[PDB]
Amino acid sequence: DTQYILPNDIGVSSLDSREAFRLLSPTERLYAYHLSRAAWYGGLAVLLQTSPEAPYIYALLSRLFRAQDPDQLRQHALAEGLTEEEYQAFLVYAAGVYSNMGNYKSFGDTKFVPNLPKEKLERVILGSEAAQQHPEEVRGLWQTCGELMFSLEPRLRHLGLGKEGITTYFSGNCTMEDAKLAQDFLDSQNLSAYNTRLFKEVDGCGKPYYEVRLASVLGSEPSLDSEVTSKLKSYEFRGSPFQVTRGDYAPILQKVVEQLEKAKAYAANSHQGQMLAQYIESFTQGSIEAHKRGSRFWIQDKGPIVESYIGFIESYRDPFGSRGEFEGFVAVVNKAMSAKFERLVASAEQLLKELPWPPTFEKDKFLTPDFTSLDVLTFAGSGIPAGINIPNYDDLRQTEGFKNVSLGNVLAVAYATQREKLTFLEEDDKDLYILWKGPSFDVQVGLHALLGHGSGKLFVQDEKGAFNFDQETVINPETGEQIQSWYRCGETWDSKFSTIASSYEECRAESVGLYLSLHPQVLEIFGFEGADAEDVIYVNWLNMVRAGLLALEFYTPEAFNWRQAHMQARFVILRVLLEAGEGLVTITPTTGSDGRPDARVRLDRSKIRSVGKPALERFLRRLQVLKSTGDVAGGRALYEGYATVTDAPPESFLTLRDTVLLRKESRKLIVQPNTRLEGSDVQLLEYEASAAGLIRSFSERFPEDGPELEEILTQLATADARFW
Amino acid sequence: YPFF
Ligand SMILES: [K+]
Ligand SMILES: [Mg+2]
Ligand SMILES: [Mg+2]
Ligand SMILES: [Zn+2]
């Protein structure tokens, strides 16, 4: 319960993937094997996308645990004066770095440090077997990342632009001003920011020069592609010098495409074969257009037995909100659980009409999307989600299609329901909570992805200003006047709304979730029918307003900034429901049984349909309108209004926040399995649900080129050392 | 667009 540290007794759970793996054919297993290898390899790039010291820390930890496993290192550490508690703190820290691919939390963007004396850890590291075998490599790493491993200077505590934040999407001297200037340049050149970073170097005269570096295997040398290499030049944008380069994470992405090529030899069909070819093209040249073509092929691969997606996909941890963090997952379709979601798709087109906006703001043609339940074998990157809506290419979402994915074996881990852990709830609600926490999620997730992220028309204009809608007929339902604002050529959702783009869209989807959860037909699809159907509704709403309070952990008062998109979104919904008044929801600061400050969330079950629905319907309509028209000014005025955290009566949120932090619970670490090629078969390796078990899972993750990866990450970090 |  201390900030910027991971507790020793932090929860660790193992991903359950054994049964899903057993059903796979030999060809499918080899397919999943190489894709997993490609994912895990690219996942290392997240280290470079997190903090300057992160690649060094991973290299140091990987060197340490290759020579001595957690039990071998224990005997050395304890012989050096460390207590078992202090050694446990180190194991938890290392598992944290592994599970996040960095020394910052993927959920909250806060730094975490080892919970033990630095000089004690030094004796362990410098006296380790890894140090005895490679004293130069180890002493160099400790000299480099040692201080930053423990430093909790205010400017290092959170991720972000400016001087009071850390980011490696940008050089250290970059600000929001620079990021905005870069995005305008990118938009004008029709160049996606997903696989790019921005570096600003001043000259001898103090004049800044901007480098937009794309991620690719290939560097400045001539290649077969012209779509990217024609962009590899110097520019003049508004007096500012710009240069588009590539070759970011080149040797890492080289490892990735090696495995994508091998996986391509086991593709079940031409859709899988061609999507992998485009991914290879994308990761080799640095073309998002190529990744788009791959994504287009990927959507056409419906109901696969082994589902996968890889690349610089989500843009949450970019403080500007346009650059993508690398991720890659490999999962097995769960035919049984995927049934309830396909029943939702079967009635999805109908349910879209129930949404609080006219079809002029809805997509033209309903494309029947793929919604499946998946059992994860591999999810590389900073963290694991519960459900996904992908691809994030909006031009594909409303013209080609999109896939919906629910990670069933991940949901099971999140169902860790303990009575003691349920904070800010009355005794009457705790029992109802545990009973329907699971079912309500499946319902919420189902609406969040399919009808949430999958709904909404975007107004666009091409190189000649003709619209994908009809300006002469379409009317803004909030003003009554014709459409005034829209998206121009090169503009995306992330490019316009930038810093609030992720939270805004997540809030819109979450609102659709609560809204359409009142629909009895939907309650049938998941099958609750009666009193149970009334119960899952209350719990879903109860969880939301509870989540809105818990969200205060992920807000930074000194920076007036939200750090987590989903939690900020849930705080907004709470503020909206609080705005409706009439005693629908109240927050009451109390005193806990332990004698510490506490709080209680009161939600009147009866006023959910009478007060709650008109509150959301009004709010949800204003969201979609501003989103469809790209009204960033109105969008920010609306969203950042509810997102405001003050100590105003009667809630006093700034006071509540101190209580939220005091009684906060750390998110579980998740251990993932490995796949090996013993002989001609693929075997699944499983690990202990612990810190040591998680460490072991990464010690066996790269058995062929482990030491090589450490050297690669080290040299890639050293190359960019001047930036921070 | 995931869901955490
Ligand atoms: K974003
Ligand atoms: Mg910074
Ligand atoms: Mg994580
Ligand atoms: Zn989502």
XYZ file of C-alpha atoms and ligand atoms in Angstrom:
732
model
C 0.000 0.000 0.000
C 2.909 2.357 -0.684
C 3.101 4.424 -3.853
C 5.787 3.648 -6.449
C 6.517 0.206 -4.994
C 5.067 -3.242 -5.629
C 3.969 -5.007 -2.427
C 5.699 -8.278 -1.523
C 2.356 -10.044 -1.185
C 1.175 -8.827 -4.588
C -1.187 -11.245 -6.311
C 0.223 -13.529 -8.978
C -1.942 -15.786 -11.132
C -1.085 -18.206 -13.924
C -2.835 -18.101 -17.283
C -4.857 -21.279 -17.835
C -4.049 -22.385 -21.382
C -3.580 -26.159 -21.122
C -6.970 -27.294 -22.436
C -7.049 -24.862 -25.361
C -3.571 -26.018 -26.377
C -4.506 -29.712 -26.284
C -7.132 -29.234 -28.996
C -4.664 -27.723 -31.462
C -3.419 -29.840 -34.363
C 0.351 -30.234 -34.938
C 0.201 -27.673 -37.767
C -1.742 -25.195 -35.629
C 0.721 -25.668 -32.768
C 3.688 -24.863 -35.005
C 1.697 -21.888 -36.273
C 1.078 -20.650 -32.732
C 4.672 -21.434 -31.739
C 6.314 -19.094 -34.242
C 3.706 -16.365 -33.805
C 4.308 -16.504 -30.053
C 8.042 -16.212 -30.722
C 7.379 -13.185 -32.927
C 5.191 -11.608 -30.250
C 7.615 -12.128 -27.410
C 10.433 -10.750 -29.493
C 8.622 -7.590 -30.456
C 7.383 -7.236 -26.892
C 10.942 -6.339 -25.919
C 10.582 -3.104 -27.895
C 8.140 -1.910 -25.226
C 11.184 -1.591 -22.954
C 12.545 1.034 -25.337
C 9.086 2.618 -25.461
C 8.873 2.971 -21.675
C 11.938 4.573 -20.089
C 15.634 5.160 -20.862
C 16.789 2.768 -18.131
C 14.211 0.051 -18.849
C 16.226 -1.817 -21.513
C 19.245 -1.865 -19.192
C 17.182 -3.145 -16.272
C 15.797 -6.005 -18.357
C 19.284 -6.886 -19.604
C 20.625 -6.875 -16.046
C 17.766 -9.016 -14.744
C 17.992 -11.419 -17.679
C 21.740 -11.830 -17.124
C 21.208 -12.388 -13.397
C 18.557 -15.075 -13.660
C 20.197 -16.953 -16.525
C 23.182 -17.720 -14.307
C 21.163 -18.247 -11.124
C 17.474 -19.174 -10.889
C 15.401 -17.553 -8.082
C 16.373 -20.374 -5.696
C 20.069 -20.291 -6.595
C 20.193 -16.501 -6.342
C 18.394 -16.695 -2.985
C 21.272 -18.608 -1.410
C 23.693 -15.944 -2.639
C 21.505 -12.982 -1.664
C 20.830 -14.246 1.859
C 24.522 -15.028 2.314
C 25.189 -11.390 1.426
C 23.016 -10.040 4.230
C 19.596 -9.717 2.614
C 16.577 -10.887 4.583
C 14.068 -13.201 2.921
C 11.676 -10.247 2.867
C 14.219 -8.076 1.052
C 14.972 -10.797 -1.488
C 11.235 -11.232 -2.027
C 10.932 -7.520 -2.762
C 13.555 -7.893 -5.492
C 11.778 -10.884 -7.030
C 8.510 -8.949 -7.066
C 10.245 -5.968 -8.670
C 11.863 -8.116 -11.359
C 8.545 -9.816 -12.077
C 7.048 -6.343 -12.311
C 9.602 -5.219 -14.882
C 8.970 -8.431 -16.825
C 5.169 -8.253 -16.724
C 5.178 -4.576 -17.728
C 8.192 -4.601 -20.055
C 9.467 -1.600 -18.116
C 9.798 -0.052 -14.664
C 6.496 1.792 -15.080
C 3.030 0.330 -14.518
C 1.169 -0.324 -17.764
C -2.014 0.537 -15.870
C -1.452 3.951 -14.298
C 1.841 4.926 -15.947
C 3.602 5.279 -12.593
C 7.168 4.260 -11.782
C 7.881 1.422 -9.369
C 11.179 0.765 -7.591
C 12.718 -2.172 -5.681
C 11.492 -2.296 -2.074
C 14.936 -2.808 -0.524
C 18.151 -0.840 0.163
C 20.123 -0.041 -3.003
C 23.500 -0.867 -1.457
C 22.154 -4.278 -0.447
C 21.027 -5.066 -3.985
C 24.416 -3.917 -5.269
C 26.252 -6.555 -3.230
C 23.959 -9.227 -4.661
C 24.404 -8.088 -8.260
C 28.148 -7.417 -8.147
C 28.667 -10.702 -6.305
C 26.362 -12.701 -8.558
C 27.344 -15.568 -10.851
C 26.450 -13.350 -13.804
C 28.977 -10.829 -12.507
C 31.642 -13.513 -12.086
C 31.187 -14.622 -15.700
C 30.868 -11.161 -17.262
C 32.128 -8.490 -14.817
C 32.378 -5.771 -17.483
C 28.848 -6.334 -18.782
C 27.287 -6.455 -15.309
C 29.185 -3.605 -13.635
C 28.490 -1.473 -16.690
C 24.759 -2.151 -16.522
C 24.544 -1.492 -12.779
C 26.542 1.712 -13.205
C 24.093 2.794 -15.902
C 20.643 1.844 -14.605
C 21.372 1.582 -10.882
C 20.471 5.096 -9.771
C 17.452 5.311 -12.087
C 16.256 1.942 -10.782
C 15.616 3.503 -7.368
C 15.202 7.227 -8.060
C 11.801 8.667 -7.167
C 12.494 12.272 -8.135
C 9.137 13.992 -8.857
C 9.891 14.283 -12.581
C 10.482 10.522 -12.796
C 7.363 9.372 -10.956
C 4.950 9.577 -13.897
C 5.030 9.132 -17.670
C 4.510 12.223 -19.809
C 5.808 15.114 -21.889
C 7.495 18.205 -20.482
C 10.129 18.366 -17.756
C 7.905 16.917 -15.035
C 7.446 13.591 -16.811
C 9.275 10.720 -18.494
C 8.635 9.475 -22.023
C 10.676 7.735 -24.709
C 8.136 8.294 -27.456
C 9.833 11.685 -27.461
C 13.228 13.126 -26.604
C 13.397 14.525 -23.075
C 13.245 18.152 -24.201
C 9.952 17.671 -26.044
C 6.677 19.241 -24.918
C 3.028 19.097 -25.958
C 3.849 22.040 -28.227
C 6.388 19.905 -30.092
C 4.088 16.883 -30.251
C 1.279 19.000 -31.689
C 3.640 20.459 -34.291
C 4.766 16.961 -35.265
C 1.209 15.676 -35.633
C 0.329 18.491 -38.040
C 3.395 17.578 -40.091
C 2.451 13.900 -40.029
C -1.136 14.648 -41.054
C 0.006 16.894 -43.902
C 2.299 14.145 -45.183
C -0.395 11.490 -44.718
C 2.042 9.616 -42.480
C 0.746 7.532 -39.569
C 2.248 8.085 -36.121
C 1.543 4.536 -34.927
C 5.045 3.175 -35.573
C 6.963 6.412 -35.057
C 8.829 8.380 -32.408
C 9.870 12.040 -32.296
C 13.288 13.435 -31.438
C 14.281 17.089 -31.154
C 17.924 18.058 -31.371
C 19.104 21.613 -31.355
C 22.039 22.792 -33.401
C 25.021 24.896 -32.560
C 22.805 27.949 -32.780
C 20.095 26.491 -30.613
C 17.817 25.897 -33.546
C 15.768 22.727 -33.092
C 15.752 19.934 -35.652
C 13.004 17.305 -35.614
C 13.461 13.614 -36.395
C 10.447 11.408 -37.073
C 11.850 7.889 -36.795
C 9.767 5.028 -38.180
C 10.079 1.482 -36.834
C 11.626 -0.935 -39.327
C 14.264 -3.583 -39.977
C 15.663 -1.607 -42.904
C 17.651 1.580 -42.386
C 18.733 4.349 -44.743
C 20.016 1.901 -47.365
C 18.131 1.526 -50.680
C 15.288 -1.010 -50.610
C 12.680 -2.496 -52.940
C 9.883 -0.389 -51.447
C 9.300 3.153 -52.687
C 6.190 3.953 -50.653
C 8.330 4.542 -47.562
C 11.769 5.345 -48.979
C 10.337 8.298 -50.907
C 9.403 9.759 -47.522
C 12.915 9.246 -46.163
C 14.026 12.842 -46.687
C 14.325 16.294 -45.135
C 11.322 18.608 -44.839
C 10.465 22.223 -44.067
C 7.300 22.498 -41.984
C 6.334 25.966 -40.728
C 9.968 27.052 -40.515
C 10.862 23.908 -38.589
C 13.255 21.352 -40.135
C 11.839 17.817 -40.241
C 13.541 14.562 -41.195
C 11.767 11.236 -41.633
C 14.054 8.325 -40.756
C 13.569 4.639 -39.987
C 15.337 1.593 -38.571
C 13.917 1.881 -35.060
C 14.184 -1.409 -33.131
C 15.697 -2.868 -36.318
C 17.470 -5.948 -34.930
C 14.462 -6.698 -32.698
C 11.985 -6.404 -35.569
C 14.398 -8.578 -37.534
C 13.797 -11.322 -34.978
C 10.060 -10.722 -35.323
C 9.845 -11.116 -39.105
C 12.025 -14.241 -38.918
C 9.261 -15.876 -36.897
C 6.435 -14.410 -38.967
C 8.042 -15.972 -42.042
C 8.210 -19.392 -40.385
C 4.641 -19.046 -39.121
C 3.545 -18.230 -42.670
C 4.551 -21.751 -43.699
C 1.850 -23.134 -41.397
C -0.974 -20.736 -42.261
C -4.388 -22.395 -42.477
C -5.454 -20.256 -45.439
C -4.474 -17.498 -47.878
C -5.947 -14.805 -45.626
C -3.507 -15.752 -42.868
C -0.727 -16.176 -45.412
C -1.148 -12.751 -46.988
C -1.779 -10.861 -43.749
C 1.519 -12.209 -42.412
C 3.275 -11.180 -45.615
C 2.012 -7.619 -45.188
C 2.993 -7.591 -41.512
C 6.479 -8.641 -42.599
C 6.424 -5.891 -45.225
C 5.226 -3.438 -42.575
C 7.884 -4.346 -40.015
C 10.637 -4.458 -42.644
C 9.971 -1.222 -44.531
C 8.144 0.769 -41.862
C 4.853 1.044 -43.725
C 1.592 1.406 -41.801
C -0.180 1.170 -45.159
C 1.316 -2.313 -45.431
C 0.092 -3.054 -41.909
C -3.301 -1.735 -43.007
C -3.346 -4.191 -45.909
C -2.446 -6.957 -43.478
C -5.203 -5.852 -41.125
C -7.618 -5.814 -44.059
C -6.692 -9.419 -44.819
C -6.884 -10.283 -41.121
C -10.521 -9.188 -40.866
C -11.381 -11.472 -43.784
C -9.962 -14.415 -41.825
C -13.171 -15.154 -39.926
C -13.466 -17.691 -37.115
C -9.885 -18.960 -37.068
C -8.831 -21.664 -34.613
C -5.652 -19.766 -33.773
C -6.371 -16.027 -33.673
C -3.573 -13.452 -33.618
C -2.749 -9.778 -34.108
C 0.584 -7.963 -33.889
C 2.077 -4.489 -34.298
C 2.133 -0.970 -32.883
C -1.568 -1.144 -32.126
C -2.754 0.897 -29.140
C -1.866 4.510 -28.360
C -2.545 4.805 -24.623
C 0.927 5.338 -23.198
C 1.857 8.009 -25.720
C 1.355 11.245 -23.728
C 0.128 12.842 -26.967
C -2.002 9.808 -27.794
C -1.154 8.976 -31.407
C 1.925 6.739 -31.254
C 1.418 3.003 -30.836
C 2.984 0.669 -28.298
C 4.081 -2.686 -29.698
C 1.991 -5.715 -28.825
C 1.242 -9.176 -30.158
C -1.100 -11.916 -29.037
C -1.754 -15.535 -29.942
C -4.965 -17.156 -28.731
C -7.176 -20.202 -29.234
C -10.862 -19.769 -30.038
C -13.173 -21.065 -27.327
C -16.143 -22.322 -29.350
C -18.257 -22.791 -26.219
C -17.870 -19.282 -24.799
C -17.906 -17.687 -28.257
C -21.536 -18.749 -28.649
C -23.103 -16.016 -26.506
C -21.198 -13.306 -28.378
C -22.230 -14.508 -31.833
C -25.826 -14.397 -30.603
C -25.199 -10.737 -29.804
C -23.828 -10.102 -33.293
C -26.941 -11.771 -34.707
C -29.033 -9.057 -33.050
C -26.400 -6.314 -33.196
C -27.791 -4.469 -36.225
C -31.130 -4.146 -34.433
C -29.604 -2.983 -31.147
C -27.672 -0.203 -32.889
C -30.976 1.539 -33.604
C -31.627 1.713 -29.858
C -28.624 4.023 -29.482
C -29.416 7.695 -28.697
C -28.550 9.128 -32.123
C -30.125 9.145 -35.626
C -28.769 6.811 -38.369
C -27.161 9.855 -40.007
C -24.578 9.575 -37.229
C -24.478 5.788 -37.533
C -22.390 3.756 -39.991
C -23.918 3.401 -43.459
C -23.813 -0.380 -43.823
C -23.755 -2.707 -40.836
C -20.938 -5.116 -41.413
C -21.409 -8.248 -39.456
C -18.297 -8.315 -37.325
C -16.483 -11.277 -35.801
C -16.854 -11.592 -32.050
C -15.093 -14.534 -30.439
C -14.043 -15.678 -27.051
C -10.331 -16.460 -26.948
C -8.013 -18.365 -24.631
C -4.676 -16.550 -24.563
C -1.477 -18.529 -25.089
C 0.597 -15.385 -25.522
C 0.045 -11.675 -24.950
C 3.294 -9.745 -25.239
C 3.743 -6.085 -24.374
C 3.015 -3.890 -21.371
C -0.129 -5.685 -20.201
C -3.156 -7.869 -20.909
C -6.672 -6.515 -21.611
C -10.019 -8.223 -21.006
C -11.491 -7.613 -24.449
C -10.380 -5.864 -27.636
C -11.859 -4.011 -30.598
C -9.411 -4.133 -33.504
C -8.060 -2.985 -35.927
C -7.883 0.668 -34.857
C -7.967 1.872 -38.460
C -11.258 3.774 -38.637
C -11.267 3.744 -42.438
C -11.381 -0.050 -42.174
C -13.851 -0.088 -39.284
C -16.668 1.490 -41.300
C -15.837 0.235 -44.799
C -14.171 -3.165 -44.452
C -15.087 -4.471 -41.012
C -13.565 -5.221 -37.613
C -13.015 -8.056 -35.148
C -14.222 -8.299 -31.563
C -12.309 -10.402 -29.064
C -13.044 -11.412 -25.478
C -10.201 -13.043 -23.547
C -12.079 -15.635 -21.502
C -9.110 -17.096 -19.639
C -8.054 -13.568 -18.708
C -11.537 -12.716 -17.437
C -11.335 -15.723 -15.110
C -8.245 -14.290 -13.428
C -9.967 -10.925 -12.990
C -12.807 -12.725 -11.194
C -10.685 -12.843 -8.036
C -13.593 -11.977 -5.751
C -12.712 -11.596 -2.074
C -15.028 -10.036 0.518
C -12.213 -8.149 2.246
C -10.969 -6.679 -1.032
C -14.371 -5.216 -1.929
C -13.901 -1.664 -0.674
C -16.354 1.250 -0.502
C -19.417 -1.008 -0.501
C -22.104 -1.692 2.092
C -22.563 -5.248 3.385
C -25.778 -5.548 1.377
C -23.965 -4.785 -1.879
C -20.920 -7.002 -1.286
C -22.952 -10.208 -1.559
C -24.731 -9.015 -4.700
C -21.360 -7.938 -6.080
C -19.622 -11.312 -5.763
C -22.703 -13.094 -7.099
C -22.874 -11.147 -10.358
C -19.459 -9.514 -10.839
C -18.527 -12.099 -13.455
C -21.767 -12.222 -15.502
C -22.104 -8.422 -15.526
C -18.609 -8.116 -16.992
C -19.367 -10.480 -19.883
C -22.448 -8.372 -20.588
C -20.555 -5.093 -20.217
C -17.583 -6.310 -22.275
C -19.954 -7.570 -24.958
C -21.632 -4.186 -25.319
C -18.392 -2.256 -24.781
C -16.738 -3.842 -27.813
C -19.497 -4.742 -30.273
C -22.070 -1.976 -29.857
C -19.694 0.421 -28.116
C -16.492 0.700 -30.144
C -18.295 -0.717 -33.176
C -20.841 2.091 -33.425
C -20.445 5.619 -34.746
C -20.114 7.299 -38.126
C -17.151 9.555 -38.869
C -17.702 12.512 -41.198
C -14.959 12.825 -43.765
C -13.892 14.968 -46.698
C -11.511 13.940 -49.518
C -8.867 15.770 -51.522
C -11.811 17.324 -53.260
C -14.350 18.238 -50.703
C -17.013 15.681 -51.164
C -18.439 13.962 -48.145
C -19.124 10.374 -47.115
C -22.467 11.739 -45.938
C -24.995 14.276 -47.223
C -24.386 17.805 -45.923
C -27.626 19.067 -47.463
C -29.729 16.617 -45.438
C -27.853 15.561 -42.290
C -28.775 17.698 -39.277
C -26.963 18.182 -35.958
C -29.490 17.044 -33.305
C -27.923 19.287 -30.647
C -28.016 22.541 -32.611
C -30.592 21.862 -35.317
C -28.238 23.249 -37.948
C -26.446 21.367 -40.738
C -23.043 19.771 -40.122
C -20.335 22.409 -39.667
C -17.328 20.332 -38.613
C -15.816 17.114 -39.973
C -12.615 15.140 -40.506
C -10.349 16.277 -43.335
C -7.906 14.196 -45.374
C -5.102 12.779 -43.241
C -6.965 13.400 -39.994
C -7.705 10.488 -37.666
C -9.542 10.091 -34.366
C -6.276 10.145 -32.416
C -4.866 13.077 -34.389
C -7.683 15.483 -33.530
C -8.632 14.587 -29.959
C -5.050 13.597 -29.095
C -4.654 13.486 -25.314
C -8.297 12.709 -24.533
C -8.917 10.531 -27.596
C -8.417 7.216 -25.780
C -10.365 8.130 -22.644
C -13.165 9.774 -24.637
C -13.752 6.744 -26.855
C -13.492 4.389 -23.898
C -16.064 6.507 -22.060
C -18.395 6.388 -25.051
C -18.125 2.600 -25.211
C -18.611 2.216 -21.453
C -21.697 4.433 -21.582
C -23.156 2.309 -24.384
C -22.469 -0.672 -22.134
C -24.508 0.637 -19.205
C -27.180 2.045 -21.511
C -27.890 -1.083 -23.551
C -27.564 -3.303 -20.475
C -31.073 -2.162 -19.569
C -32.365 -3.945 -22.669
C -34.128 -7.226 -21.718
C -33.266 -8.763 -25.102
C -29.545 -8.387 -24.390
C -30.073 -9.968 -20.978
C -31.441 -12.960 -22.812
C -28.438 -13.332 -25.056
C -26.380 -13.857 -21.963
C -29.526 -15.434 -20.484
C -30.579 -13.983 -17.145
C -34.233 -13.316 -17.825
C -35.866 -12.284 -14.566
C -34.810 -11.198 -11.138
C -31.343 -12.327 -12.193
C -31.558 -9.985 -15.178
C -32.480 -7.156 -12.822
C -29.563 -8.194 -10.614
C -26.878 -8.168 -13.316
C -28.071 -4.689 -14.295
C -27.735 -3.251 -10.790
C -24.308 -4.823 -10.269
C -23.061 -3.497 -13.608
C -24.169 -0.004 -12.607
C -22.933 -0.514 -9.044
C -19.512 -1.564 -10.312
C -19.318 1.479 -12.579
C -19.986 4.112 -9.914
C -17.624 2.196 -7.632
C -14.972 2.177 -10.354
C -15.490 5.908 -10.809
C -14.477 6.435 -7.193
C -11.545 4.014 -7.350
C -10.379 5.897 -10.442
C -9.036 8.739 -8.290
C -5.886 6.665 -7.767
C -4.990 7.292 -11.406
C -5.290 11.072 -11.236
C -2.375 13.432 -10.608
C -3.505 16.613 -8.771
C -0.173 18.413 -9.176
C -0.293 17.926 -12.942
C -4.092 18.032 -13.249
C -3.742 14.953 -15.431
C -5.400 11.559 -15.748
C -3.013 8.633 -16.190
C -5.398 5.857 -17.201
C -7.978 6.150 -19.979
C -10.508 3.603 -18.707
C -10.519 4.911 -15.137
C -10.829 8.546 -16.228
C -13.747 7.400 -18.371
C -15.438 5.749 -15.397
C -14.967 8.854 -13.259
C -16.720 10.840 -15.983
C -19.702 8.480 -15.905
C -19.827 8.848 -12.119
C -19.812 12.635 -12.478
C -22.577 12.431 -15.079
C -24.703 10.241 -12.814
C -23.929 12.525 -9.868
C -24.993 15.443 -12.060
C -28.426 13.871 -12.508
C -28.988 14.183 -8.764
C -32.284 13.020 -7.255
C -30.394 10.717 -4.888
C -29.435 8.279 -7.643
C -25.833 8.047 -6.465
C -24.073 9.519 -3.423
C -20.580 9.303 -1.941
C -20.206 9.327 1.839
C -16.874 9.716 3.670
C -16.997 7.370 6.665
C -14.680 5.626 9.120
C -13.494 2.074 8.513
C -13.493 -0.719 11.082
C -9.695 -0.481 11.176
C -9.980 3.105 12.399
C -8.861 4.555 9.073
C -10.774 6.958 6.779
C -13.254 5.209 4.480
C -16.179 5.876 2.135
C -19.446 4.369 0.912
C -21.144 4.354 -2.486
C -24.941 4.545 -2.375
C -26.802 3.684 -5.582
C -30.606 3.653 -5.557
C -31.633 0.602 -7.589
C -35.022 2.126 -8.417
C -33.813 5.361 -10.018
C -31.574 3.629 -12.557
C -34.223 3.624 -15.289
C -35.985 6.841 -14.269
C -32.969 9.070 -13.645
C -29.942 7.135 -14.884
C -31.103 6.346 -18.419
C -32.097 9.934 -19.283
C -28.732 11.059 -17.898
C -26.726 8.669 -20.070
C -28.912 9.039 -23.168
C -28.372 12.800 -23.061
C -24.659 12.377 -22.364
C -24.135 9.587 -24.898
C -25.783 11.629 -27.654
C -23.541 14.627 -26.979
C -20.527 12.308 -27.115
C -21.337 10.805 -30.507
C -22.248 14.146 -32.078
C -18.951 15.784 -31.120
C -17.090 12.619 -32.127
C -18.742 12.295 -35.539
C -18.150 15.949 -36.394
C -14.617 15.943 -35.002
C -15.566 18.874 -32.785
C -12.404 18.688 -30.673
C -13.124 22.070 -29.072
C -16.593 21.021 -27.967
C -15.357 17.518 -27.226
C -12.721 18.781 -24.812
C -15.088 21.311 -23.250
C -17.535 18.476 -22.612
C -15.171 15.715 -21.509
C -12.589 17.707 -19.532
C -15.522 19.326 -17.751
C -16.682 16.081 -16.155
C -13.068 14.918 -15.835
C -12.329 17.844 -13.514
C -11.253 16.769 -10.030
C -11.908 19.316 -7.284
C -12.577 19.285 -3.545
C -15.979 20.872 -4.157
C -18.946 19.953 -1.918
C -20.537 17.641 -1.238
C -18.297 14.918 -2.711
C -14.884 16.485 -2.038
C -13.115 14.232 -4.546
C -9.623 15.518 -3.734
C -10.258 14.435 -0.144
C -11.741 11.130 -1.309
C -8.600 10.470 -3.354
C -6.444 10.253 -0.226
C -8.834 7.591 1.056
C -8.796 5.752 -2.276
C -4.991 5.606 -2.238
C -4.890 4.583 1.424
C -7.064 1.529 0.794
C -5.981 0.778 -2.777
C -5.162 -2.733 -3.969
C -2.377 -3.605 -6.410
C -3.305 -5.226 -9.719
C -2.323 -8.896 -10.073
C 0.755 -9.966 -12.012
C -0.015 -12.586 -14.654
C 2.316 -15.465 -15.518
C 2.135 -16.700 -19.106
C 3.186 -20.111 -20.458
C 5.855 -20.965 -23.031
C 6.021 -23.223 -26.077
C 9.013 -25.385 -26.999
C 9.958 -27.504 -30.006
C 11.137 -30.765 -28.450
C 11.684 -32.998 -31.464
C 8.848 -32.679 -33.964
C 6.177 -31.660 -31.456
C 5.222 -28.487 -29.594
C 5.099 -28.697 -25.805
C 3.493 -26.201 -23.435
C 5.540 -25.105 -20.421
C 3.654 -23.846 -17.370
C 4.958 -21.995 -14.324
C 4.245 -21.310 -10.656
C 1.811 -18.473 -9.971
C 4.415 -16.418 -8.118
C 7.099 -13.775 -8.591
C 9.740 -16.482 -8.988
C 7.497 -18.397 -11.373
C 7.001 -15.313 -13.535
C 10.751 -14.724 -13.561
C 11.287 -18.335 -14.633
C 8.798 -17.900 -17.478
C 11.033 -15.203 -18.966
C 14.217 -17.152 -18.259
C 12.927 -19.880 -20.574
C 11.235 -17.477 -22.983
C 14.275 -16.985 -25.221
C 16.422 -20.147 -24.999
C 18.175 -19.761 -28.369
C 19.189 -16.094 -28.428
C 18.682 -14.840 -24.873
C 22.163 -13.319 -24.413
C 21.896 -11.796 -27.903
C 18.655 -9.995 -27.052
C 20.271 -8.485 -23.961
C 23.100 -7.083 -26.075
C 20.629 -5.778 -28.664
C 18.498 -3.935 -26.103
C 21.663 -2.586 -24.493
C 23.077 -1.136 -27.716
C 19.718 0.259 -28.856
C 19.370 2.080 -25.539
C 22.961 3.339 -25.643
C 22.399 4.757 -29.128
C 19.572 6.999 -27.900
C 21.161 7.879 -24.551
C 21.685 11.530 -25.507
C 17.927 12.066 -25.813
C 17.218 11.858 -22.081
C -9.430 -0.410 -28.606
C -9.034 -2.872 -25.696
C -10.769 -3.046 -22.321
C -8.956 -3.031 -18.976
K -5.071 7.573 -28.307
Mg 9.449 14.265 -20.573
Mg 1.304 -5.171 -16.863
Zn -12.583 -0.608 -24.985
